[PDB]
Amino acid sequence: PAYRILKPWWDVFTDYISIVMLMIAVFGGTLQVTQDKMICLPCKWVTKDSCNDSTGPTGIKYDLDRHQYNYVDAVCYENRLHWFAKYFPYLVLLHTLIFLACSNFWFKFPRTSSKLEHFVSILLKCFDSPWTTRALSETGVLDKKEGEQAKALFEKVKKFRTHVEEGDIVYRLYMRQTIIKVIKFALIICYTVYYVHNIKFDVDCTVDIESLTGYRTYRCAHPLATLFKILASFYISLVIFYGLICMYTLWWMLRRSLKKYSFESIREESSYSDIPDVKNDFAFMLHLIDQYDPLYSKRFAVFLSEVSENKLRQLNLNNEWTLDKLRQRLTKNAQDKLELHLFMLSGIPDTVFDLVELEVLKLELIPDVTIPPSIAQLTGLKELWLYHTAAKIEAPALAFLRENLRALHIKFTDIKEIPLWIYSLKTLEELHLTGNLSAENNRYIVIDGLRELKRLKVLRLKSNLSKLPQVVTDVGVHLQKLSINNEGTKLIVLNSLKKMVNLTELELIRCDLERIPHSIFSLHNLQEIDLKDNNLKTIEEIISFQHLHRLTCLKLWYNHIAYIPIQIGNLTNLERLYLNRNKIEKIPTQLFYCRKLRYLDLSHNNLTFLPADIGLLQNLQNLAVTANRIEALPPELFQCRKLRALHLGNNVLQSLPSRVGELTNLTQIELRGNRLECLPVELGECPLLKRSGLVVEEDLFSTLPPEVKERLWRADKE
Amino acid sequence: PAYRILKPWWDVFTDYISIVMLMIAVFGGTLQVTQDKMICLPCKWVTKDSCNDSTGPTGIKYDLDRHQYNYVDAVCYENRLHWFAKYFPYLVLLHTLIFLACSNFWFKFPRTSSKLEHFVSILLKCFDSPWTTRALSETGVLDKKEGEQAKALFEKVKKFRTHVEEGDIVYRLYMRQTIIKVIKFALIICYTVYYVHNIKFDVDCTVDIESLTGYRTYRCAHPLATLFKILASFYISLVIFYGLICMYTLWWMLRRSLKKYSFESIREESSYSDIPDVKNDFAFMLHLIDQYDPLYSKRFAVFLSEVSENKLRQLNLNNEWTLDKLRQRLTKNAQDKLELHLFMLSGIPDTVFDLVELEVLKLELIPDVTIPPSIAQLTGLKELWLYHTAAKIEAPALAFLRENLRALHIKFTDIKEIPLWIYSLKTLEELHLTGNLSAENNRYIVIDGLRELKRLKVLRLKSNLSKLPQVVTDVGVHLQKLSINNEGTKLIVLNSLKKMVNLTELELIRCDLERIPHSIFSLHNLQEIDLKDNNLKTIEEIISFQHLHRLTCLKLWYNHIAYIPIQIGNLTNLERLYLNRNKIEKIPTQLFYCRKLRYLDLSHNNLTFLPADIGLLQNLQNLAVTANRIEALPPELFQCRKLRALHLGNNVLQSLPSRVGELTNLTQIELRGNRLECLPVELGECPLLKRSGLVVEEDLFSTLPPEVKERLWRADKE
């Protein structure tokens, strides 16, 4: 059936003893009801209310009719026969019924019956699940339905365990009913042994009946006395055994503290040490199961272990993300390297470590992930991005990283979630800290270990830092690229950059400087300068940039500057100048003294006209003047032949010179938003020009001869 | 039901006998309770407390009313009727109940009830499993679910076997209850046969009742005496049969030692000889099953054989390692041919032999590997790798390998674990021994069979040779490439290389020569010679190498040479020369006389400067001068234009000569570890120059003008 596992050997022994006692009770009751007469005979001679018992023999004449004998039998039976001899079977029946009631009370009381049914259903479901079979076998691939069933079983087992530990009702009812059984056995044995000698075959009744029969005392015989006596002896022996069993049950329930379950055997033998001991009302059920069969408890033990749940989740992720299905999700970043980005995953699948070709791994919002040593299988992995991810490392994996790690990007909201092994990677070249290093008024101790990286070359601090850290200044002695994104927070250098003399990039995006630092003049090794959104008003510091012999990538876009300084003519080695999103009205001629410009870009600025000496800069390749008040392009703009990109959008350009055919290198040109009424007929005289190379509105697209349109459409096939 | 298989014929016979005895008990009980009266009559004439039994006949007047007769009947029934006549049905009921209880004890006792239920569940599952059907049919294609279920059933059967052999409980209870049955039958027969004569129709009761009736003795009649007597005879016959059955059960359990199961008939008939005998508490259940039906035991026996587990593993391997998986798992080795690597696999999947394009097979740590004839299905297979695997091959597959096998790789630690059929492979061309052939005071007898293979070209002995085996000396007269690696173990020749006349490769890696052997001079046909890690001291024997007019690949790295002899100039055929990892203070100029050097490399040498004569080596391709204290490079060296690779690591260099720019065939060059600070501009103009070709420090790369960097990186794509 179903509840056979919930009854220990003593319970079934008591059940069978109760059945035998019920048979005794019904046999005695049938005996009494069918015939329990008391055959009484008056005796002539009386010796203190007792019969004296003092040619051929002859019978004794009593002159009593049959009905008088029946009456004296009835009176002597009701009055002078001991109540035990008359009511033994009924007392046995009542005691057996009470024993059965107190044995089955917890099975029938709904408050505990529901809990028992829930526990047995859960135990049966957890006993036969193949996940338990696999876990016991281990002491590769499982079906999705099986994994989902195991996950649901884990969840409901945990919820049931949480719900049950506060009950403490099944154990209380079991203990109370066992106490009732023990005390009932004590009383039954005492009174039955005391009164069993009170039943006998021959009895004497002096019932005081003279006016109806004529004799006072009667010698009476009870035919069932011997049978009732042997039945009482049998019932006494049965109750003795029942009481011994109940005493054993009490001793078992009072010498173990059954509210606490050990659960140590499996966790010390199978090494499943992460199984906490259960509280009251659940240790009792497990003890009962142990008394029935320890294997059920052993198989149910796996569902309470965190290791089992964790490896179940890992197997679920392995099934969900196969190798072929995961190579599909591989993507390429801007740097053209294989990138695997995990988003909102429950963890790191172990199948991702089979991709030897993996090069970039990005982890974003995965909770409490431990990088398994299987990462040692990978070879080409160089970038690891942990955005809001706390990753814990193992010993072989940490050494593998310290040997073969190149890049690391981490974003964090609190310091406590940053890796504690980040400093152990002494070969990391580039680091990207986009968290919030401003702890509780600390001197950036959380990054004080940045000096450990002796091969650190790129820094990407974006943490709203109020000032450049001492540790950063120390580590910048061998730093190639320094990038600070202060998000508009005011930053003060205060003579802190001259320590670094090997920096090549000094990106200062949103540092809110408002002034070009005076220490940047000491970094003659700087080549790329970016000052986006620093609220810079005066940029006359170009008067000191000529000492920097490698200044070639001066970028000053997204700023508020009025007039370009003449000191630009001081510099000569400028290759990429960017001054977009500014308010500049006049373009100086001396700016063109830098004949090495390649990617000059002046777009979204309050410009008015293009100087006619731009042809003097024949090395120009790109020039984007989108969103500017440029009335017309001067012809000298087309003197250059090396120009490639030319973006003139949202500009008031009424006319376009026909000499566009002079430039063969003009690849992409953008003229959307301009006030053009007709297009040059030499626009098609460019061998290298595709559909994406021309960006104009359709309405004016047909004003040119259709032949060049057909040529362009023919060249746009592939 | 389910336990009918667990009850032999004696069990069901005893159950039916107990049913019949219970019918006797209830019939006798109903008889006694319904009417068990004893009709007594007083006798007037008495002879020693016994009735004497001494015109028309007339009745005898006793002057006793009916109630006096009832009283004397009751008294004579209780006192002078034998207890057996009154309590025969109740004793029969008690004995029947005890017999039933001791028969069903083990089924109802939970400790053995759970074990029996688990055993019968496992037996029923293993009886109808189609895996047993296949195994018995064998004395094709199997579903994945069926195979998984079969593996799980195998595992749980093994676990149950491990759990049960320590029990020894069910057998003990069965033996004890059979002993109880036998002794109870003995006592029942004794007392019942002794007291059956005590029941009789006519009885005499001298009950001493004079004050109530007036007669001393009474002749009484028991109406049920004859019915009870025939019932007792029937019950005695039934008990005799029951006792004989129990005696047979005891004899069956005491002449076979049921703790141990032979299990040898099936394992000797079906060739499943690998079925170990089961221990106690599990052999007993098998004996019971044999008593019921041997077919259940035979079908359950397959799960206890290692052979069935092995073939189930093989089938699961074939189902798992599908054709597509192995096809995708094929790799390209260094030799540019299809290769497949098997690591720690339990066997070779049969789907592997369906990859006709396979050419190289690698097996490592595969235990008890058997090559089926289906390897003849493979056609492109040419090399076999047997790493720590003992391969067993049949006649057709052996012929296929004798006809279509080129190379062989075997790894071992013992002599015996190598294949004994290796010498049967006539068309073998390459051999790879990586074991320990140094046996107990033998002249390498095991490899003595190498004389069988006259078609061999490559021999790769690696067994830490102390003396060259005579078999190798005799077989080297037709050998092409001989590579020997003793891992620093001493090697002696004593005129052992003179026998060979046509050898070309003489790799003597880590053979602890400590001196150049004098037997190598006779091998004028050698072309490649290497003496790495041979503890050499002086190499002035080059005068004896003038006989070798084909010596072009003499390698002497990883040695200890004080200086290069001046006899190198006598030779002129040097094309690949190596003296790496040595301590030589200067390179003599005569060594540069040989104009046809192409792969001269001198790395990790204590060299001071390179003579200008190195500029006459216009034919040199690769030159490695890493870890050399060369202060400057001669301009004459850069005059050549056929140089292909120049590696410079950890060298004393402050600047690079400016005439390298004239080089156009320079494919690659490295300057890592040097304290250089200036990179000449003319280095940026070269037809053969890419980012991979020139790898230098990041800081030093920024000193060159950037205009060529964009052009180079734009062509770095393809």
Side-chain angles (χ1 to χ4, degrees), chain B residues 402 418-426 445-450 452-453:
Chain B
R402 176 189 290 252
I418 85 174
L420 292 84
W421 46 264
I422 171 183
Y423 310 134
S424 177
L425 272 37
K426 297 297 165 300
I445 173 182
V446 44
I447 60 179
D448 204 1
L450 255 306
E452 282 271 9
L453 318 182

Side-chain angles (χ1 to χ4, degrees), chain B residues 566-669:
Chain B
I566 71 175
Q567 284 70 18
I568 300 300
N570 306 139
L571 285 174
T572 178
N573 48 18
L574 285 315
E575 183 265 314
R576 295 181 181 87
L577 186 60
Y578 297 109
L579 286 86
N580 302 324
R581 278 68 170 185
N582 279 254
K583 291 81 188 175
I584 306 172
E585 55 191 18
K586 263 304 297 179
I587 303 299
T589 64
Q590 50 82 33
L591 179 136
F592 305 104
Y593 290 167
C594 324
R595 302 280 175 260
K596 63 179 58 58
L597 264 311
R598 293 202 277 101
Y599 286 146
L600 168 59
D601 291 336
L602 304 175
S603 67
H604 184 200
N605 199 341
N606 312 25
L607 297 178
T608 59
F609 51 88
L610 304 179
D613 197 8
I614 201 177
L616 294 193
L617 282 65
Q618 291 85 194
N619 200 23
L620 205 158
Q621 307 178 333
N622 177 24
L623 169 54
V625 208
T626 75
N628 285 106
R629 306 276 76 99
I630 311 298
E631 278 64 37
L633 304 181
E636 186 70 17
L637 178 56
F638 288 148
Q639 188 171 352
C640 314
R641 312 301 159 87
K642 206 181 185 62
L643 273 304
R644 180 170 282 97
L646 292 314
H647 192 2
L648 296 181
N650 186 20
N651 299 334
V652 175
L653 292 176
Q654 72 173 18
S655 181
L656 180 116
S658 56
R659 67 195 314 268
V660 193
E662 285 79 349
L663 269 296
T664 56
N665 200 19
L666 187 143
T667 64
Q668 53 187 352
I669 181 180

